[PDB]
Amino acid sequence: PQITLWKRPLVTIKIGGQLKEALLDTGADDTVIEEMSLPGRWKPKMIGGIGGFIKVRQYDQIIIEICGHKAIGTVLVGPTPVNIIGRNLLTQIGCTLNF
Amino acid sequence: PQITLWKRPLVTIKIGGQLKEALLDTGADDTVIEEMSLPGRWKPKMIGGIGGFIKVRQYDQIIIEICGHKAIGTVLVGPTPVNIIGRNLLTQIGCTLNF
Numbered sequence: 001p002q003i004t005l006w007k008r009p010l011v012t013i014k015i016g017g018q019l020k021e022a023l024l025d026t027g028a029d030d031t032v033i034e035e036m037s038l039p040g041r042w043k044p045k046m047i048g049g050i051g052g053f054i055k056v057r058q059y060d061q062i063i064i065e066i067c068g069h070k071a072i073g074t075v076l077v078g079p080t081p082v083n084i085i086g087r088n089l090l091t092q093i094g095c096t097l098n099f
Numbered sequence: 100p101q102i103t104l105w106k107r108p109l110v111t112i113k114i115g116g117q118l119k120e121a122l123l124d125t126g127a128d129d130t131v132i133e134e135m136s137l138p139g140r141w142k143p144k145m146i147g148g149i150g151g152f153i154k155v156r157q158y159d160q161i162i163i164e165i166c167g168h169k170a171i172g173t174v175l176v177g178p179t180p181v182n183i184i185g186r187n188l189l190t191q192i193g194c195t196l197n198f
């Protein structure tokens with residue numbers, strides 16, 4: 001699809017068999033989701049935002065659907081204000097910025 | 100143009116007679132620029148997200164040139180780690196997400 005930016009580009013994602021809302025964010029290097037249970041081992045990661053740095057849990061090769069487009073990749077879990085789909089997954093679904 | 104998301108979508112902008120590098124950020128509602136002088140009245144505002152909040156100065160009706168496209172809108176000025184072009188100005192240059 002083609003998504004304008006007059007409102008937040010919020011889309012439905014499916015992760016761990018559950019539907020959630022997430023923001024398509026070109027300004028985010030990685031994907032970060034609110035607290036949830038994910039399988040496997042996690043690795044430590046620090047991400048920086050507008051107000052400073054936060055610690056998150058990094059899970060790899062996680063299956064996730066974004067607006068019905070299938071992706072498998074790195075998902076970070078931590079104290080994020082909203083679920084954010086960053087460039088790591090936007091590139092997987094072939095998302096581009098156009099003007 | 101068509102901007103892919105393999106790397107950070109950094110562009111050159113012209114604001115208040117200065118050239119700056121800024122990130123095209125669909126996840127940001129507002130445009131936030133590092134400390135600089137802007138003309139006119141301003142009001143304080145708090146903006147937040149990953150890492151918490153920061154205090155900024157809100158200037159209205161500011162002209163910005165993004166990739167040669169002229170846009171007018173509110174610009175927040177404060178201690179941001181990166182200059183951000185948010186949705187309030189991305190809509191003005193007719194920027195869309197496509198996949």
Ligand SMILES: O=C(CC(c1ccc(F)cc1)c1ccc(F)cc1)Nc1cccc(F)c1CC[C@H]1CNCCN1S(=O)(=O)c1ccccc1
Pocket residue numbers: 025027028029030031032047048049050051084086107122124126127128129131146147148149179180181183
């Ligand atoms: O990719 C990064 C680092 C990045 C950055 C971007 C913006 C920013 F404000 C702070 C850092 C960066 C760092 C240094 C540099 F020179 C160029 C870019 N961050 C990261 C990684 C995974 C996930 C993730 F969410 C984030 C944060 C994304 C940002 C920007 N898009 C909106 C959501 N946020 S926010 O800080 O919450 C925010 C909220 C309201 C207004 C403005 C920013």
Ligand SMILES: [Cl-]
Pocket residue numbers: 010011012013066067068
């Ligand atoms: Cl959707």
Ligand SMILES: [Cl-]
Pocket residue numbers: 072073074088089
């Ligand atoms: Cl990934």
Ligand SMILES: [Cl-]
Pocket residue numbers: 171172173187188
């Ligand atoms: Cl505005």
Ligand SMILES: [Cl-]
Pocket residue numbers: 004193
């Ligand atoms: Cl439009």
